[PDB]
Design a protein around this ligand. Structure first.
Ligand SMILES: C[C@@H](CCC(=O)O)C(=O)O
Ligand SMILES: C[C@@H](CCC(=O)O)C(=O)O
Lengths: 290, 290
């Protein structure tokens, strides 16, 4: 039983903090959108007036925030307020550069810090099946585990500070490329007169099989639970995939790496996000149809 | 059952050896003496022309390098075949050529399937090929006892051409995936994320696919993958390049919109200019050419 400050109580942070309450933790919350704060207080978070007040009496500080800028700004307002050797876990999805900068900022103020961004969306969050991908010290993760466990389906240590954000962004670049290529295959099949069910049966039984087809199949019929059967409601929105791909391109730009298909997938999703940010990212298949 | 096997190359030779092994009478033809001689050593009665091999056959199998050679074999032999002979083309060719050749054969009173294969020389020899079949269900049924001793799997894909359609769509996706995975590994490495960490995360996440879980293009995480054995095929860049050319023909023929499949095709066509003899996963070392 730890005291946790939870900064960022939106779509992810609210269900996450609820599970912590449910696990017996004292959760001290802050979010500058009062709608969000009020939702979390209803599920037992003690909501404070300021981020610094929230963090004053915590052993652990979790951030779940929209950008690296907002994380950097929040760290700057609060690190001085926390007690020395408080454990900070950033579970926001931000750039690897941002994660390292802020990790170093936290350690220079005498705080332990991890990056622990998550996959699973709001449904994962509410059911406590998120995957945590963690960057930082092994001993710091050991200390953190009892806090992460009531939120998690899995916790995987990825390496030194930043490696959590790196792992997630690498996977999600791959995912985006696969989701587009699967959409291309299904449209080409349709013009070839190969049925959707037949193509599904072959790819899922062969070397091309991947989550984008077996779970996220972009045509209705073969996988009744996929977004294609529910008007492409997310699921995993185009808005969010476009964010992760911007972060992948930041990583590419920062390393000098070459990622021809990842970058092509970034452009394609950037264009599609302008008008269909609201649709599951499998809905990119519409751009391939005339 | 008497079988005429036309094309006794690297795939054709072992396939026909399995047919001999299963108790069929195999009649053969190949324009290379070395191929014919090899085939004759495992029990194929080799003839000097293809119309001759076909004369006594209940089933005629082609394993030939292009649609044009397939079409030409068909017009050289159809008149020499008995009525209701079952023709099976297991060559990899365009869907258009497959359909034309199918129509040609059934106008001569023949029964015809397209049944291209995955698994390579090693699958051919071990009798584990995956046949993806286009044509009538009743014709596949009749063909089943012939295909079974060459095969690990048999999938009915739809009407004539659907087998070529299914294989070419799966192979276009695979090539994209192989490149995307290489990009992720190279990116991870420049981010200071280890190969093994990325491997652990992707294989347990949504990015997982054969191109990583079995064909991992960095040495270590999958000791049997071609990356640990000097990129010895495996599945050669030459043969991936071949299937992608057929994918691009199918895209041109239909007016399809396949950006990432076409980009992959460009990437491998260029790579095949230098490294046609390496496993296609070797693409990881040509990304800086781009
Ligand atoms: C993910 C964690 C279990 C926590 C949970 O099931 O909520 C673990 O197995 O490491
Ligand atoms: C399992 C396989 C049986 C043929 C064989 O004997 O290998 C098939 O269904 O094609």
């Amino acid at each position: 039983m730890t005291t946790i400050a939870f900064l960022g109580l939106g779509n992810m942070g609210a269900p996450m903090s609820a599970n912590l309450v449910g696990a017996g933790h004292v959760v001290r919350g802050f979010d500058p959108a009062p709608t969000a704060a009020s939702g979390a207080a209803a599920h037992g978070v003690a909501v404070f007036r300021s981020a610094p007040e929230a963090v004053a009496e915590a052993d652990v500080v979790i951030t779940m925030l929209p950008t690296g800028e907002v994380v950097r700004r929040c760290y700057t307002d609060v690190l001085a307020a926390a007690r020395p050797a408080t454990l900070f876990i950033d579970s926001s999805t931000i750039s690897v550069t941002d994660a390292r900068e802020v990790h170093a900022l936290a350690e220079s103020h005498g705080m332990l810090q991890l990056d622990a961004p998550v996959s699973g969306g709001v449904k994962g969050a509410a059911a406590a099946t998120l995957a945590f991908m963690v960057g930082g010290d092994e001993s710091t993760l050991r200390r953190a585990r009892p806090v992460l466990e009531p939120m998690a389906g899995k916790i995987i240590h990825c390496g030194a500070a930043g490696a959590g954000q790196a792992a997630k962004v690498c996977n999600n670049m791959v995912l985006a490329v696969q989701q587009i290529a699967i959409a291309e295959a299904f449209v080409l099949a349709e013009k070839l007169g190969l049925s959707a069910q037949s193509l599904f049966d072959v790819i899922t039984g062969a070397t091309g099989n991947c989550w984008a087809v077996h779970t996220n199949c972009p045509v209705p019929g073969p996988v009744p639970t996929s977004p294609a059967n529910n008007d492409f409601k997310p699921g995993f929105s185009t808005a969010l995939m476009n964010k992760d791909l911007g972060l992948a391109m930041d990583a590419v730009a920062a390393t000098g790496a070459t990622a021809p298909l990842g970058s092509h997938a970034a452009d394609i999703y950037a264009k599609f996000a302008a008008d269909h940010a609201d649709l599951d990212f499998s809905a990119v298949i519409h751009t391939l149809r005339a």
